[model samples]
Target chain A: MWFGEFGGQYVPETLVGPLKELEKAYKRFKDDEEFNRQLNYYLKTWAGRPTPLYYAKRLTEKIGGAKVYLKREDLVHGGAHKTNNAIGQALLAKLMGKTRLIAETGAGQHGVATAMAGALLGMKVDIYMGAEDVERQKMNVFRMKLLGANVIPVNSGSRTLKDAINEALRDWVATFEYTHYLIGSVVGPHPYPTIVRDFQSVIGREAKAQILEAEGQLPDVIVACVGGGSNAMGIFYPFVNDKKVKLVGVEAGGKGLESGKHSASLNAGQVGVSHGMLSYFLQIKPSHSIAPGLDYPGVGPEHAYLKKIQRAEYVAVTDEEALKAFHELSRTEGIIPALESAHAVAYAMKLAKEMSRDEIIIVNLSGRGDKDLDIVLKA
Target chain B: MWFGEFGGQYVPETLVGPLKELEKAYKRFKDDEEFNRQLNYYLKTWAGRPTPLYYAKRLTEKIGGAKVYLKREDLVHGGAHKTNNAIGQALLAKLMGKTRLIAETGAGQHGVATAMAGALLGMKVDIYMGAEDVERQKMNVFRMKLLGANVIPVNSGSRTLKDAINEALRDWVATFEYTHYLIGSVVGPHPYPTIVRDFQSVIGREAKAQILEAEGQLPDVIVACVGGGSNAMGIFYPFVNDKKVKLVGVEAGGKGLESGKHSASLNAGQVGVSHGMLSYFLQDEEGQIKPSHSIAPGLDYPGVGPEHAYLKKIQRAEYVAVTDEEALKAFHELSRTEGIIPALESAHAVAYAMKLAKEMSRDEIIIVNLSGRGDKDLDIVLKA
Candidate 1:
């Protein structure tokens, strides 16, 4: 029921049976050789696994400090690390004999990844998106539809991510026997945070080996942006035991910390129950971020647990700083990063300056910015 | 001057000296170990080379005949096989101490590739696009600009690709010492066609080894869409000596071949000189080149690579056409089945492979070269 007092299954009574079923299936297949073999096949042939760990020579020189390496999850198919967990969970659904898949998305990265997995596995997919977000992220909606997913726009409540997630939970309760609710991040409930983190740990495992191969030693620091915290947890999990390595989660400070507009849930918010788990959230009041993916009120419970134990540190970067990093990386490294990931890049940029030249930093480039090009161009 | 009477240098005399210089440099570096090492380094680390030779399991089952494989050049950096040649030529330019790169583009794929390479190598790049094309492919122009390239709109003649190439030639004539005219495909005069083909042959080289590792045999049939024919030539060049293997080239039948609106040069056009090469072209009366009209502007070039002309002449490869509707169908089919939205150019090959699958046995294999992705054509597809 808890990741050291952070995670719990706090959903309604109707969902408990299905949640237990999910946990049983997950436990059975998580280490099964056949399940792993099939998952690895899809990861390599379909999702383009082991995305290159690129040495950002120019960006490193420009920053004038630590040698920076980019774990290029942006190169994965569907153009993000979201595909890794999407395919993983979809395979589990198939093993459980679930005939349909359902998910809720904010910026549509998760929806698109789910749609891709559904298409490949020949399962019916329905994505619930907030009505307002459906308007802002039209391309992703179009892409999901192209991948044969039905995008259900939820207009109740704020007509945003929270409402869409609420609608998805209602749908899952009514149809859990045949439909697997594919949660996008490590935030939903007990097994979900654990499941998503385990699937995503591929990021950390691969990066650990790649950095050791590229450099003779471990990195001084690893950074990732936090929203639902799947990508951060995925990369940070393998390194959690390495006390010598420092883990940093960069949250979106949309305007600034003082402006009360940022989505720095851990840095500025208190622990609260939301999205079926007790986690650090923007509980003083709701907040927003310029980056749609990071414009969330709550983070995953595992992140709260990590922060509470002092195993990791959390920081905030302003929208201005993120934008600067986005443009700088695009122009200098020829790699345009997702705006959400730019928060981590911005923090790394600042951190690199305080470290020596021999120190190393690894940034998880979670996704490509092609999806954000229009917004960036408008900005 | 010819590949069995198919290829020849037919450019104006003013360009001969620059062409000779290009030929000399290409010859010197084509086999140089240091040059090969640097190119391979960039291809592996930067462009993400040896792109997976993915088995199209779903597509194969849907077709229910031949096993289908996709050479995923669509996954290459800058999102196309165009980058393979772009990085190679840009490296050659750097080796030759060239400070500037110039290229002419129709739909901007090649221009984007060239611009990316230029940015990575710290060389100045100028891309010439037809005025009309610049208006239609504005996103690509913006992308090129973002990569620090200058996009020059040529507003001469038809204000399209042909005019842009002429403008590029004019620029190269004056700036040959410090500038390289990077041709995008294997359709140009001697050494350009040879050079571009050699640069792109890495596709075939990798696929050859990958297929043998996966299937323990070479593919029975290999198909690629032919525009200026670099992608096809790249994959086909390595398999030419494998006599049992069949090579097929798909051309864009925009409407239909008999409709006179398609870009099926090899099927309908006669031998003529266009774009500085003697090859099959859509030349009408009085030796004037006819403007090709296809839904895909990238495949509208009148002339194909001379090697294609020779292949067709000797019956070494069969040339077929896929209608605009057929290509669009294949595009959607692939997107739904494999979650890969293929470029319109690559769709023609997919369509051909689909038809060929019906005639062959399940044990026989077909490798389709997915030359590019579909983001560029999304607007057009949406409008349609």
Candidate 2:
């Protein structure tokens, strides 16, 4: 266990027993065939899966070197790859006989997806989002309300995702009888990082098969943006053992890396313990800074493990470069990638110009930026 | 053909030659099998069809009087039935060797869908929207831009859909050589209404097959909301010939039927000519009046399809009213129960479903056409 030494059972002593209990229950249910089948069923008919892997021919041609492919997680019903995790966990909650599902969100993508799943499965859902997040992501808050989920504004420390997560954990601890905590990303307790990676691994699993079918060989490189690292892990974990394939993780360098206004954890910061895990994190003294998606103080434990093992390389692109890439893709390729995903695309754009035309570089166009259009437009 | 006596080809004398040319070109392409094939491919692969006909199990159980099923057009890619028409029209333009497509939109669903299809096919798209609409639907304008479409604001006349349509027609007439007009709804001239309806009829055709597989019998009633009546026509047309099945068209009573602020063309309107077609229209003395208004921007049209008006008069379909309050309630109801947030336009049908369910017996079946999803309206609902 990568986390056994660094990311292990580091929590409030009172919560340790419940965390172990939850882990044991999840382990028993994780590989159970019956549990997997029901999850598959819901993911297919209800959640809408196998989101098309579109070939960005226009971008590929214009970039003039490496081929670019977009894993259209934007086409997912809840509007991002977050649905994949939520549906999987909500089904587990149902199996656990928990009638209520709880979650925390920063930009509200995860909250909305969980709320959608809860509504579909006829379960009660409550989402803890920072009061500031509730204001910044008003549309998503309305979306959750429309889906019949209760959105509780967390006005605690920093008023952001970390605080929201803290509140959710407290709620789950207090109401464990009928409630299940649905952690949003790959950064949580032991089983959460593992279980989320398992559910989200569909991205890489499908992309691996798709690349072969489309190009008749494995891609030379796989790139994805890393925040909590769920999307990156989803598309990178399956190819971890493949020796020839280079894995790249893009971190958000909001504003700029050197200006001291960025969230490039792997690029600029050292390993630290925050929340429940020890991983490479962005912090000033001890406080997690903000980039909305990258505001987390730590990376997923699995990502940190991969980094320490030298299996994955970390890169950073400035927020200005990412904004330019966002507009570039929108205008040239006619696809608007999420700002988080644009950081990876910005790196891939540079790599595409430098690499030989024969070299295949696959960048995970992780999400659609429609939700961020307002912010991008003003910027 | 249903245009009023004065409504036939009332064009400038010099434009007759060009109109003839357009008519001839459109006719030639209408029968082209290659054009049909490409359009069908886009519809299937890109739009994610045929959209499932979902059983409203929970809503039906709660209603308790009638069994309600939903024609889930809301599930289509781009989040609306508008994508079906957009894809077909853009494909037709592609087959015609046209590189640029132009359109006009009100609520911007059609504009967004057209921009999306244009992006997919690498075609240039320009959308004309009223300045008022541009101000109101900023998100959609940005979406069009992101999809690589040029969104032009038309700041003339009433500064609404009708004005945008006028601007689009003017642009089309001027740039006839290279531009193809991608009309949004089913209320245009002969070829447009016919073409849009043909492309959209897949909704009804699929509903017919799906309801049969699910219920083992034709539904007792088919319900849909009417704006220019495209969605309603799309879902109701296939069931029209089946005499045993009832068809219900719900119109947006913006405030109320008696408030004179509604777009209930079929319920409170009189027969008139507007937007190049004779249909149920909202007008006043001297037969000229302001266009309609509704909480649902998509359902704010003053004129409806002549086919729908004809159906209503012949008693082939029943025209109903859906008030703003009832529609909002149904929107929330559908959201909570089905996990599908429907557009304000589609919520009209949901409102009717609530009423129909109460009046009908438990064994009777009703199918509501859910034309679009409500993700676009999340802001409005939040503010409300």
Candidate 3:
């Protein structure tokens, strides 16, 4: 089940069996009524899903083009789309009879989501984060600790996300019998890319029904920001076959592509083997971005495949443009979107300037900006 | 009509006509379909209304007596129930053709809500706050500025919420033709308690429907923290007619009532007229106001909602107070147990519920109104 030349089990012998076992367990329970019931119950009653697809009348009027609608994942519990996958994987691991969860993070957004799910389900959680990132995201570190998660600082190599992932993988390899490694995005390996998308597809599934009911038709364009591309993949999955609906993914351009300080892996980087998957990555690099969440070196394997197949368009937004959009949206709409989500907003404004006012565009407003207030203020 | 002998318009003759004018507009648009449609549109899409009545499973299991459901107003866009009334009042003012909003605050929660509503509705807002509160709540002051609201620091006598309220009143009295004095709670004169409760009734209304559908019966007890009592009033109003349901309001005990350090006016205080309403307030024998105390700035008020005083008088709702230490314990426990960092004001209700939960039978249900979140309290909690 590879997405083109991407997505396969490329791990040590010890980890191969566990990954396969996880796949089998996920497959069996993916359709089971009891598992589905439990999933829906927690997603609704705990994490607060079916978030509103708000018509951005103010934003649209300011931009003066498309009928803009924002998918309100920012309003979700734990304040991000990261929770959709965290809760999904945490529930799966618990139902698979695991008692502990292991996950990796850079900005600590996914770490907070994991800690939230683990606490809710009474599952022990260990988050492996970069020593550098741990120092940078002190607020989220407190949030994870407050949620009863053990934050392990990975100090090896570049001491960032790639390094953190290695530690998480090693932890899972040793403790696979009773602990499940919860991957945060649709990137890592087989099952993870598939599994994360399935959980996140709820974004599109709900948006599809909401837009149809609101506008009596599908959106003309769908937009989302991509880090490891989970939010983009989630919203893009259901509309892949709907050829008339164009899907757009925005990557962090950081300082600029010419300066080589960007994370636009799918848009500008070469395809390679990294993070246990064959995909477009920045050839093992330290990326830069104004938005910490979008500061990554690679993207989801499916995103690489989507770009390769011309199923979706990939572009990048500069830090200057993203910050402008962030402030504009906050000032105009009073919705302070996370910086990661601001990349998509920046591009949507550009696209909206060209599209007709009657055309509908849905942009995934992935997370709240409460956590980014310090960064915003300092900047 | 007055709720027993609590609510009345005790204001100047100059303010009387403006208050009556407000009443007339509220009556005209309160039932108008156009007003409701616009209100609902903004509430759902902007403020994220119909917030989940979250089943606090881990919390219930830890408390070990009654099942608990938190009416999650903490998930509201501004992170509190202040927005419910702020939005309602602002929208009412906009429909009444007002271009400016004048409000006051101590903790800055209500100011932020008003500022947010003003920003959303494209109305100019001026928030008057105590000079001390301006220095203390720096982040919220920044937030108000970011939302394009002017923060007027009042350096009046006592330089607190009371003085700020006086400043807002003066501003409104002078500019009533073009500005609406948006009161944050049910503490103001006639039409405010009624106006605020009507907007906030959405909480109890949603909770009522949610509980009935989830549990197939009304909850045995409803718990909420009361400062000016907008949240408690909102949630309690819907169940007032459900005579079988028990309503309880928890006030901030601060340190202890015996030490004369608490906001437990309804629990142990005298009645008085303040902010245009007769209500229970912490005052000296001469009827002069005394400074009240609470770990929560939002819950440190001396006077409570006039409606709450009436509810206490009618024996319809019981009022109690929880100490600061107990509230701290509840905050930490809720954070660890359920991963929800509740407002310290809300922690009073949680602490009271934990004790009440143990006293009640296992088959019973207790609904606690989680009025706000604890993101604003991280500094105090972590520092302490």
Evaluation by TM-score, superior candidate among 2 and 3? 3
Error at B5, model 2, angstroms: 12
**Candidate with maximal lDDT:** 3
Clashes of 3: 0
TM-score of chain B of each: 0.98, 0.94, 0.98
**Model 2 TM-score relative to the real fold:** 0.91
Candidate 1 residue-wise lDDT, B1-384, digit = tens: 578888888988999999998889888998899999999978876777778888998889988999999998887776689999999999999999899999999988888889888877778999999999999888888778777789999987999998999999999999989998999999788888888999999999998998999899999999999998999999999999999989999998988988878888899888887778889998776777787866765787777899899999999999999998998889888888888878888999999999999788999999999998776777687776
Compose the digit string of candidate 1's lDDT tens values, residues A1-379. 6879798999999999999999999999999999999999888877767777778888888889999888988878777899999999999999999999999998888999999899888889999999999998888888888788999999998898888989999999999999999998998977899999999999999999989998988899999999989999999999999999999999999989889898999898988888899988886476777778897789998899899999999999998898889887876776778999999999999999889899999999998777777787777
Best by TM-score: 3
Which lDDT tens digits does candidate 2 get at residues A264-295?
A: 77777777766677777765332222225655
Alpha-carbon TM-score of each model against the true structure: 0.97, 0.91, 0.98
The local lDDT score (0 to 100) that residue A264 gets in candidate 3 is 90
For each model, chain A TM-score? Answer: 0.99, 0.94, 0.99
The top-ranked prediction according to DockQ is 3
**How high is the lDDT of residue B150 in model 1?**
93
Model 3 clash pairs? none
| Per-residue accuracy of model 3 over A266-329 as CA lDDT, tens digit each | 8777888777888888857778898999987988889888888888999999998998988877
CA lDDT of every candidate: 0.88, 0.80, 0.89
Q: Where does model 3 exceed 4 Å of error?
A: none
lDDT of 3 by residue, B27-48 (tens): 9999999999999988897787
